[PDB]
Amino acid sequence: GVVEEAHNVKVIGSGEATIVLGHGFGTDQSVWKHLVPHLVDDYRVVLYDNMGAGTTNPDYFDFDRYSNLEGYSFDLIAILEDLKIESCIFVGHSVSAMIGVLASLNRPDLFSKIVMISASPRYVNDVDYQGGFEQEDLNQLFEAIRSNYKAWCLGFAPLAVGGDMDSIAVQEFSRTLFNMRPDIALSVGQTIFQSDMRQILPFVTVPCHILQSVKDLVVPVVVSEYLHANLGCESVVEVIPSDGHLPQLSSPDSVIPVILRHIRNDI
Numbered sequence: 526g527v528v529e530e531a532h533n534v535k536v537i538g539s540g541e542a543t544i545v546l547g548h549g550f551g552t553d554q555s556v557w558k559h560l561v562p563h564l565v566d567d568y569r570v571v572l573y574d575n576m577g578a579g580t581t582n583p584d585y586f587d588f589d590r591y592s593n594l595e596g597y598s599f600d601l602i603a604i605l606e607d608l609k610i611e612s613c614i615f616v617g618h619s620v621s622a623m624i625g626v627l628a629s630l631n632r633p634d635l636f637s638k639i640v641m642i643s644a645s646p647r648y649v650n651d652v653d654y655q656g657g658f659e660q661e662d663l664n665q666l667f668e669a670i671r672s673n674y675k676a677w678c679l680g681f682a683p684l685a686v687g688g689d690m691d692s693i694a695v696q697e698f699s700r701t702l703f704n705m706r707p708d709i710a711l712s713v714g715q716t717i718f719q720s721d722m723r724q725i726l727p728f729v730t731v732p733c734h735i736l737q738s739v740k741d742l743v744v745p746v747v748v749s750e751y752l753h754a755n756l757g758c759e760s761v762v763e764v765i766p767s768d769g770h771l772p773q774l775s776s777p778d779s780v781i782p783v784i785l786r787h788i789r790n791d792i
Contacts, residue, residue: 579704
C-alpha cells in the first residue's frame with residue numbers, strides 16, 4: 526500500500542493487543558531493535574519511519590505539511606487507519622512522544638496508553654521554564670547544520686547518544702543522521718527544536734508514562750517533572766540511571782526492563 530510503503534511500515538504478529546512504536550529525530554525504526562524481541566510474543570508490533578527520515582523518499586517530504594508537528598500526527602493516524610487498528614499502546618521516542626500526544630488529542634479512541642522515551646514539550650528556556658537550550662544555542666546548532674552537515678553529524682552523534690564516543694550505537698546514529706537529506710535535516714531540526722507543546726498538555730486524556738535517561742543532552746530531568754505536572758491525564762515518571770537520548774539503543778541492559786515494565790503494567 527501507498528502509506529505502508531512510504532513509511533516503511535512493518536507489522537509483526539496478529540491479534541488485537543497492539544503496540545505501535547515511533548522513533549525520534551535522526552534515527553529510524555531500527556532504534557527499537559533491542560525492545561521489539563521482548564514484545565512480539567505478547568503483542569502485535571507495528572514499526573514505521575517518520576517522513577523525512579533518511580530511509581524515506583525525499584520527494585514525499587512536504588515542507589508545508591511538516592512545518593508543524595501536526596503533519597506527523599496526521600501521518601500516524603493515517604498509518605493506524607490503514608492498518609485498521611482500533612486501539613494501541615503507543616511508544617514514542619523523542620519527538621514521536623509529542624507526535625503521539627497530538628494524535629491522541631484528535632483521536633483519543635485509538636490510544637490506550639502512551640509511553641514516552643526522552644520526550645520534551647519545549648527545548649527553549651525562558652525565565653520560568655528550563656528546556657535545556659537558550660535560543661542562541663539553537664541558532665549555533667542550525668548554523669552548524671547549514672555550514673557542514675557531515676561535520677555536524679560527526680560531532681552531534683556522540684553527544685546525543687552519550688557513552689563511549691566510538692560505540693556501535695554512536696556509529697549507528699551518526700549513519701542514520703547523515704542519511705537525511707541536509708535541507709530536510711535542517712528544516713525538521715528547526716521545526717522540532719523550536720516547537721512548543723506546553724500549552725496543549727492539559728488537554729491530554731490518554732494516560733502517559735514518562736521515561737528518560739538521567740543524563741540526556743537535550744532533555745533536562747526537570748522536563749519529565751514538567752510533563753508530569755502539566756499533563757491533563759493520569760501519568761507516571763521514571764528517570765532511568767542511564768546515559769543518552771537514545772537509551773533503548775545504546776544502553777538496553779538497564780533501559781529495556783524499565784520500558785517493558787511501563788508497557789506491560791498500567792498506572
